[PDB]
Swiss-Prot record:
Residues annotated with Phosphoserine modification: 26
Family: Belongs to the universal ribosomal protein uL18 family.
Protein role: Component of the ribosome, a large ribonucleoprotein complex responsible for the synthesis of proteins in the cell. The small ribosomal subunit (SSU) binds messenger RNAs (mRNAs) and translates the encoded message by selecting cognate aminoacyl-transfer RNA (tRNA) molecules. The large subunit (LSU) contains the ribosomal catalytic site termed the peptidyl transferase center (PTC), which catalyzes the formation of peptide bonds, thereby polymerizing the amino acids delivered by tRNAs into a polypeptide chain.
UniProt-annotated stretches for the region Disordered: 7-48
Subcellular location: Cytoplasm; Nucleus, Nucleolus
Complexes and interactors: Component of the large ribosomal subunit (LSU). Part of the 5S RNP complex, which is a LSU subcomplex composed of the 5S RNA, RPL5 and RPL11. Component of a hexameric 5S RNP precursor complex, composed of 5S RNA, RRS1, RPF2/BXDC1, RPL5, RPL11 and HEATR3; this complex acts as a precursor for ribosome assembly. Interacts with isoform 1 of NVL in an ATP-dependent manner. Interacts with RRP1B. Interacts with IPO5, IPO7 and KPNB1; these interactions may be involved in RPL5 nuclear import for the assembly of ribosomal subunits.
Disease the record associates with this protein: Diamond-Blackfan anemia 6: A form of Diamond-Blackfan anemia, a congenital non-regenerative hypoplastic anemia that usually presents early in infancy. Diamond-Blackfan anemia is characterized by a moderate to severe macrocytic anemia, erythroblastopenia, and an increased risk of malignancy. 30 to 40% of Diamond-Blackfan anemia patients present with short stature and congenital anomalies, the most frequent being craniofacial (Pierre-Robin syndrome and cleft palate), thumb and urogenital anomalies.
Protein name: Large ribosomal subunit protein uL18
Listed Basic residues bias regions: 12-22
Species of provenance: Homo sapiens
Top-rank lineage group of the source organism: Eukaryota
RNA sequence: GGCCGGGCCACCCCUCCCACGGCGCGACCGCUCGGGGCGGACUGUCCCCAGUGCGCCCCGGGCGGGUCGCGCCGUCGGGCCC
């Protein structure tokens, strides 16, 4: 430690831009999901 | 009544720039009632069923803003009335 305290960083740049997280859904997607759920529920009733 | 010369305007021609307004034609930018091809995600129609955004590029219609913009039209317009 006394002889060499200097820190050198480790380089890493050859990384592809991969996303591991689900992106936030859009307003159009949420509205469509609500519409599909309503349609499916009405369909289930009319099948009875 | 003047007594000689100058300009400027009224007139004919042809002639430049600018301003303002209108119309049309480009090129650029921004703003989509939409069409093609891959990546996620959604629905109780789940047999290649259905529907929604997103990333790149290619087409289609309309709108506005800048454009030495470019032409045309108008001004008892302006340029010491070029
Ligand atoms: Mg003159």
């Amino acid at each position: 430690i006394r002889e060499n305290p200097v820190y050198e960083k480790k380089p890493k740049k050859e990384v592809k831009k991969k996303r591991w997280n689900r992106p936030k859904m859009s307003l159009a997607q949420k509205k469509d999901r609500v519409a599909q759920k309503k349609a499916s529920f009405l369909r289930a009733q009319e099948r009875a």
